[model samples]
Target: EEMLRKAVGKGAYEMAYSQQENALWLATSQSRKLDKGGVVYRLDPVTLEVTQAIHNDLKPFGATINNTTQTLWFGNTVNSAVTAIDAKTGEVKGRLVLDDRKRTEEVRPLQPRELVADDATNTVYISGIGKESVIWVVDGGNIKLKTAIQNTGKMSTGLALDSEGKRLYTTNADGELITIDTADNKILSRKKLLDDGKEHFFINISLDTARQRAFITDSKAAEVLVVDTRNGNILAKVAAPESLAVLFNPARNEAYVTHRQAGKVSVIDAKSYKVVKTFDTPTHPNSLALSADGKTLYVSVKQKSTKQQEATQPDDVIRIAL
Candidate 1:
């Protein structure tokens, strides 16, 4: 496939595409606990050129957009907070810092791991990683912490929304698929994924809401676990490299996977469930975002840096023509 690549900055995490403003938003940072703050760049969708840069002191990491409301949301992992920005004007909208909950021996504070938004309701969900993990349910407009689903599972990572955000799915370190009812912010069910009785880390997930399928990336097992989201059944496992991120485009009937360990990305046909082609992205492929038309895919390719080289070396962002 044809592509356009650019080295944007040092630390790149997640991305979101906006059709309304004709821009692609990228969340970038230098380190996890950078007091130097962070930058959210608005890029030219086709050329991967920076259009606008929104600098923040709290650090923007995991990114998602409430398209209808024209709000851009990002997770502050190092801090127990999240912030919102105006997608078009790059103006700071709001920021919500969660209250410090009780953290005994069994309990730990929630760290922002991922951010996902439901534009229809202007709701944003942030999966908090801790000993006893929780999902922070926040109001995207006012950027207030509404409630949290406590004790979701250990080390909750990947989050996917379905049924128009009525249902939410999460993958945890215990190798379980968790279902939560977003309307009430309650845990509905927990289905333990396939156990070969070996070590595995389920890192990221993507979904086909129409066909009721969830594509989960297993970083340790190096496979894409196709699951029936409704029943939590293990439908199939497609062999892949040690994967970190996955995205499904229902409009194009394709799913894209990022193999961080193998330094590759694969495009799989949703209907046939086969890898149509593989693209080698060196260093690391960390995140994926699709265009509004579902024809182009954006990948955040990070670089492996030592303490000496980390300051000078930059990361890559690839625009893949699908």
Candidate 2:
């Protein structure tokens, strides 16, 4: 199918790639109200079909697949836990609770925003975005809490890893970019980004390890910040209003960024860091995922009844041919 659209369970917040299944998994959350549950939908890469739906008791946000363990790691915002699912069977394996405050209260909220897993290191990093912002590191094999990196930022929005899985990058609400060495779990560097002499909050990021460049989305500044990964320098800034999600395709040497307010996806050349093409979407796009071959792109459109005129309309996932 050249283009396909399917209505997911609820709020399609984040997507993850499953290497063992050769498919994509989407995490859905109920943002209409608090304490609502969520689900995870498994999708076929080629046909853009919904194959399975895994239900969760908590509101799910960011997710990642561990190829080595054949498990899916997901962050639960309301439950304040990192859950593990069987990638092949879609079964709930276990959970690693991150919030210590929830132990006595049992319902204390902590926002686990984004997650990234490293097969080589056997670890999954989860970003917390509530009152206490930290990166929760879990053992990929046993789904246990390995350690926690404290004071990441006010709200750590996104997390990304290099191709070698040696370096981890996180964008925060304080307009700062932090790099961590995965080998030692230590902060390598942290730099605050500025736009027009004012700090810009970084919401998302995509890394090009081959070229040593990182494309970060500045939501407040309406621009994309290109940083040199080697030295943490601001290389270039391109216009993209309300940029939320970004993906780098090495085969095409371009980065696809989603602009929520503009309802458009901007294509930027990796070498020039310029917007070369813009594609319009039906709804406000929030997240993006690419096929293994990098020949197809999938976009998650947020279609809340309040946001859209049609009350019966649901959130959708669309496939775009590259």
Candidate 3:
């Protein structure tokens, strides 16, 4: 509420994307405590009001939307299921279960964290961080497991897709960024950005196909690694003010990264791979989503009060007008 209030207080508004209009879709991670919160909220673009909230059976984590199908998909990190919600009606359409066939005694679902969809192939890709840090492909209709590619890492956090090249990239908790060829199901390249051993966490990736560039976020080092995907070479390293979460905005030819600990979002030029500007956010600016027009950037911020301020739950979705 504080976060939402801050957004409205700042003369900014939440754009809802759920109702086939110019609205913002905000995915909120629920607290472990029961009745705290569940599912995500759909906010009004103009009035900053929460028009609707979609409550799923499972917890909501990382999410993505396929504008082609007008479908919203998100991960239930605790349940290992990818729940597909109808973008128009907010209905629970299907659940894509990530099952590890190698394990028999207990039919445990693969730890699916982040999701990305290929609208052309009607396929959804999930990052499995449980056993082999693999990427699992599923059918868009039934959510059935189609194929799996091993990443040979500890944990997979961020997953990005390049439809033009039929390629996928994932950042493992082991501090390695692995790229896979979707056509032949082969691991194309692996680049290590940090030496976190077993503690490397939240490796997020953003790809710029036109520039043949790949950016990976190193949370431990508080830096972003710029790599040449075609040659698998680290080109440049950009220092983030805090833990970075990176993404590419093709329309702007820019790299949008969030510095969580610093509560800021850094925008970098795609061609030069240099930091162009930094905007202060309310708190922990972690996850981000872009508007269709590419003029506004949305972020999920976490703000906890300190000794100077009273504690409040200000987890909100905010937009930064470009």
Candidate 4:
């Protein structure tokens, strides 16, 4: 059994913890119904109880918090946009539809993937997923679109920022690691982690900046790749069955990977480059949020809903007190 667990709500996709307010903000869509659309819940991180809820109909997905500006942002996945809300009051500050991105030959719009807010700089970097994607840089303070970073490679999924180092990292379906200069919003470098011409798809990434490393979850390869940031080289590839979401905790020097298909979460010891522990979470594990002290880990566990399994069990939010 988990240290703490609660059946939160439907469509739990991403979460952000606000230490200033001592609350957890989690994204939950209204289960594909037309009644409410998209919703975000504020919960007591320790008690796993809902304190409040914010209902926004744009289909919120990816979430991140900017404590400095007191803003919590969510990627409106279906609408190809993002919305900023007051973290403390749950009032929407701004909503930006990514309409300016150049359309691909397919004539399809960009779908927002991940949102990474650098509170120190008050800048929000988001991935606009498509056949050819771009990173949209917006001002956290003014809620304005600053610039759109082009040539980020196809299908850029997750994003990680090196605050003081002034760098942004993202991986594409092409199995390429892209480095962006945060100062200018330009691609600084591109390294291929898997260049064997295989059909590789990388989903999410986590950074260990102090050690100059990046931990990437590769669902297509079913492994977690430890990369050296100084020079794009694969330091290690630890097998993580159906790896999807990932996070690197600097305090413990460990990387946690969520295996969706395998229904497990694996903890990798950075020093040893090994999966030291695995926690079986059946069905699906979607996203992770670490506590302010980095001693507790929270995950959104999704359950399968099928015809045979009607009136299915509600999804759970599990807290692991590490």
User: Which candidate number maximizes lDDT?
Assistant: 4
Give a tens-digit lDDT track for model 4, residues 231-299: 988899897796899999988989888999888989999999999999877778889999988888999
Q: C-alpha displacement of 320 in model 4, angstroms?
A: 0.8
Which one wins by TM-score: 2 or 3?
A: 2
The candidate with the higher TM-score, 1 or 3, is 1
Query: Where is model 1 more than 4 Å wrong at Cα?
Result: 31-35, 99-108, 163-165, 307-311
TM-score of each: 0.94, 0.91, 0.84, 0.94
Whole-model lDDT, candidate 4?
Answer: 0.87
lDDT of 3 by residue, 16-67 (tens): 2533556666665554443342556766754556777777677677777776
Minimal lDDT window, size 10, model 4: 305-314
Cα lDDT tens digits, model 1, 233-267, are 98878877778899999888989999987889998
Candidate 2 per-residue C-alpha lDDT over 1-322 given as tens digits, one digit per residue, 9 for 90 to 100: 3667777755777787765598898888754454367888898876757899888876677777777888888888767888899889999997878885743554445568788888777789888885447888888788888888888877787788983958999988888899998888888888887735776668888898987899999787777988888887888988767688999999899899998878888888877889988878757888888877788888888774564343355578888898
2 or 4, greater by lDDT: 4
Question: Model 2 off-target regions past 4 Å?
Answer: 30-35, 100-109, 163-165, 306-311
lDDT at residue 199 of model 2 (Cα atoms): 62
Query: Residue 220: error of model 3 in Å?
Result: 1.3
Q: Note the Cα lDDT for every prediction shown.
A: 0.85, 0.81, 0.70, 0.87
TM-score of 3: 0.84
After the best TM-score superposition of candidate 3, give how far the Cα of residue 182 lies from its true spot, in angstroms.
1.5
Candidate 3, which segments miss by more than 4 Å at Cα?
1-20, 99-109, 193-202, 305-314
